């Protein structure tokens, strides 16, 4: 039993809700919140800009030190950093950005990072400003993640569409 509330169950291990991931993180304090990161951990907009803003820029300060030490992530890769005031940990995961021409097949590799964590609160990778089809992203999530994932979808309209079209 966990503290996530109001989610629709899609499969044995995947759950979905119309929610603001920032507000959901603030209320649940999950062990892991997933950030929709880029390789530079520059949290300027989308989910990343919102999460970072909610940490009063502490996420960005920590991220800049991480990059200065380790260099950029790989597309499809991830790193674990602090969850600050939102979660114990933040798993920064880089899905391919279609608006940068990155290969969509890397979306499966991106979701594989979730399997290293038993339970996660997450957005749909490569959705939103990353330019992928959120319905495809949901399908890859369901077919790749085996651990328990609670997906927060900010837009009520997209949420209804994802549910109504789910196979």
Ligand X SMILES: O[C@H]1CCCC[C@H]1Nc1ncnc2[nH]ccc12
What character string, x for contact with ligand X (CB under 6 A) and - otherwise, covers 135-164? -----------------xxxx---------
Q: Is 21 in the site for ligand X (CB under 6 A)?
A: yes
Q: Closer to ligand X at the Cβ: 81 or 138?
A: 138
Report yes or no: 131 and 98 within 8 Å, Cβ to Cβ. yes
Residue 24 phi, psi dihedral angles, 5° rounding: -65, -45
Residue position matching structure tokens 């890859």 = 140
Least CB distance from residue 43 to ligand X, whole Å? 12
Q: Is 95 in the site for ligand X (CB under 6 A)?
A: no
Which residues in the 115-134 window bind ligand X by CB under 6 A? 123-124, 127-128
Number of residues this chain uses to bind ligand X (CB under 6 A):
14
Q: Closer to ligand X at the Cβ: 65 or 140?
A: 140
Q: Closer to ligand X at the Cβ: 117 or 159?
A: 159
Least CB distance from residue 132 to ligand X, whole Å? 9
Residue 101 phi, psi dihedral angles, 5° rounding: 80, 20
What character string, x for contact with ligand X (CB under 6 A) and - otherwise, covers 33-52? -------------xx--x--
For 160, other C-beta atoms within 10 Å of its C-beta total 12
């Amino acid at each position: 039993v966990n503290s996530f509330s109001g989610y629709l169950k899609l499969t044995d291990n995947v759950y979905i809700k119309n929610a603001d991931i920032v507000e959901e993180a603030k209320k649940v304090k999950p062990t892991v919140v997933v950030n929709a990161a880029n390789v530079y951990l520059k949290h300027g907009g989308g989910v990343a800009g919102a999460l970072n803003k909610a940490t009063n820029n502490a996420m960005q300060v920590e991220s800049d030190d991480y990059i200065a030490t380790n260099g950029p992530l790989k597309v499809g890769g991830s790193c674990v950093l602090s969850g600050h005031n939102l979660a114990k940990h933040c798993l920064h995961v880089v899905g391919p950005n279609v608006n940068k021409g990155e290969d969509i097949q890397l979306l499966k590799s991106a979701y594989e990072n979730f399997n290293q964590h038993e339970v996660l609160l997450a957005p749909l990778l490569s959705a939103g400003i990353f330019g992928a089809d959120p319905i495809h992203s949901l399908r890859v999530c369901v077919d790749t993640v085996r651990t328990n994932v609670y997906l927060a979808v900010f837009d009520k309209n997209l949420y209804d569409k994802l549910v109504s079209s789910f196979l």
